[model samples]
Target: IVGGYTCGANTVPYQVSLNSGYHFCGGSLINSQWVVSAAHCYKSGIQVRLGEDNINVVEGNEQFISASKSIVHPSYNSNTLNNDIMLIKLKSAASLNSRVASISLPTSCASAGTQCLISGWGNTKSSGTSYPDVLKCLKAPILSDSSCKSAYPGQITSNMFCAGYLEGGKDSCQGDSGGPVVCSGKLQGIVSWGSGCAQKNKPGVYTKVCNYVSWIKQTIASN
Candidate 1:
């Protein structure tokens, strides 16, 4: 997170650090056995770490588990990054406790101007290596669809939405892709892409989670 502070322990219990021999992305625990992240973060050897705070430290509450399987959205477009969401099945169900739990998916769609919280372990600066070992967060507002269109015309798709400052002081950066962009205590968006990290009028684009609530449920049930 660019220009954000380290989150207090257990404050973001649903947040997970995605690993494949190293911390590469972030995700949200939507259920004991399922994690939601961006499809673009998909790669072989993906592992899930629950109850994580500082990635560099052991953090006694953390649970390291391998992925049993993963399902990226069928219509996911890599070129435009549309429908950029994915669901990962844990090899073992995570134990729901004070330090580890799942978050509720958005009950309704996010609206313009609604302030939302984005948490991750991505770079703290637009450039340079400032990735924090601890989870960091920034609260940004959801911009209107028209504004998003203006910011990145032809890039914003139906399943995508924009959030962050128009002035570009903070945002979710690289390595933060696949992290949670939460609103009203619900998982409303998944960190997906942006033209640049927190550039003026170039807010972070996210995979709108509300649009895929059914896909997620059906995928989990049928599997």
Candidate 2:
């Protein structure tokens, strides 16, 4: 995350690192056996590391598990980044402990201007090629739909929302996709896509989690 600080170990217990040999994306443990992330992060042979703060080391708190199956939203639009959410069914359920837990899903949409926390191991700058080894977090205020629409014009949709600083200092950048955006101690959004890393007036766009609560419940139930 750009302009973010390193998070304390187990500060966000539900946070997971989605890796394929190397860390590539972030996810949130929504249940003992399921992880929620951005659909755009899906790929073959991906695994999840739970209860981890540093990606470079295998801390005793970490639980590395292979994904049994990945379920993406059928209506997902890659071009427009709509419904950019997915669920990963774990081969084995995660063992819950002090350093590992599940995050609660939001019952309602996050209010505009609400401060939300986004954490990940994404790039520290827009042009940088390296990702942080430790988890980083930043606080970004939720942008109003109308204000967000002005930034993307015809690209904004109801299924999507925006959060970040308008002055262009903090945001979720490359490698941060699929990370959770927690508001009021609940999962409110997922880091889906953005114009750039901390661009002026170009807040990071996210998949609205509340809009798909029913879909998430139904998918988990049927799967």
Candidate 3:
């Protein structure tokens, strides 16, 4: 979770570490051979690490696989961060077990005020330079688009949504991008961008997964 501390080893099995020689971002295992993350998080030499809690040290259940292809949304905008979502096709299908599993995508968008959970190995504190070795998780409530727009005027689009504390102190930070935001046991959002980490009234922004469900289905089918 963004503003939270270390989590249990198997607390979030669908969570995956995106590595480019080092831990760069986070992702979710959506299928046996497919992973979902933020488009902005993409970089060369990306690989997926599953079934691991501590990224610094290899665990017995860890499974590392190279990515064969990465498909960023056609409408992705770097400046506006619109449609900031992507898919990573693994070179081989992950072997599912208790330690590794896929998260279910949502059929509808998350309602405002819904409490959600986010997990990652991002910076422990907003101003910290170092990242955590173990996975961290925290709870954040979904904010209405109007409230979000108030915080980031002319920036929050229909393709995006917001979540986090209104007062501050709990949110996703650097390196937490592309991580999963699970709501009601379903995948509802993908960590996209935010101003400062856990700043007052500036909640973490995320790609609305429900808005891209059809596109995701078509992309997967064609690929």
Candidate 4:
């Protein structure tokens, strides 16, 4: 959720949960029947909740959906952290209320300097512990391909997008994976990784949503 702003817009958003278990991070309801999340967060005993303020215990009217299927990206390489994305098909369709709704997919990549927002219960600082109840969010600017490639020097790829502070601190950490990087109220990226948690000159990398449009469509075909 967006942080710091109200009335005209919402801010300081947090996800609500029913139990103390921390499993899923974020999910997208693809079509009227399925939801997409990260495979790493998948577990048979875990449940998915949306639009809640606290995760330690359920606080809102949000309901939990039992996971019917968890599809991890086939090319995912745990060692190198590649193809780190997944889809979750919910046991039942979610109610289409304003507080709970699907985040739109990006059809194209956002240009450099464009602002985006990322949120999670991830660590608030470098090597810090994940937040227990409150979700943390940070503003990120989309970096140019050349700049990101230059920073990572051959590690950056066309399929990835970079975000985070260049000055160190304030970034998505271990538990943040599978979350969204939103731009213009639409989802543009998925949390991937960084060299270290909030390191100076290092930025958190994300799976560029635009690059996987076709694959997502084919993998979880609609209509």
Q: For each candidate, what TM-score against the reference? A: 0.98, 0.98, 0.97, 0.83
Segments of candidate 4 deviating more than 4 angstroms: 1-20, 30-32
Once superposed on the true structure, which residue ranges of model 3 sit more than 4 Å away at CA? none
> Where is model 2 more than 4 Å wrong at Cα?
none
* lDDT of each residue in 1-223, candidate 4, tens digit only: 2221111111322222212255446555554455555555555654667655455655665667766666777876666656667776667877766566677777777888889887766555465453545566678888777768777886876668788667766667766667778888777877777887777778788877776667677877752
Query: Candidate 1, after superposition: displacement of residue 221 in Å?
Result: 0.4
For every candidate, C-alpha RMSD to the true structure in Å: 0.8, 0.9, 1.0, 3.6
lDDT (tens digit, per residue) of candidate 2 on 135-179: 999998899999899998999999989999888988999988999
- On a 0 to 100 scale, what is the lDDT of residue 121 in model 3? 88
Clashes of each: 0, 0, 5, 7
Distance (Å) between predicted and true CA of 80, model 3? 0.5
Model 3 agreement with the true structure over 104-137: per-residue lDDT tens digits? 9998888999999999988777675767898999
Clashes of 2: 0
Tell me the TM-score of model 1: 0.98
Give the worst 10-residue stretch by lDDT in candidate 4: 1-10
Q: For model 1, which pairs clash? A: none
The local distance difference test score of each candidate is 0.92, 0.92, 0.90, 0.64
TM-score preference between candidates 3 and 4, better one: 3
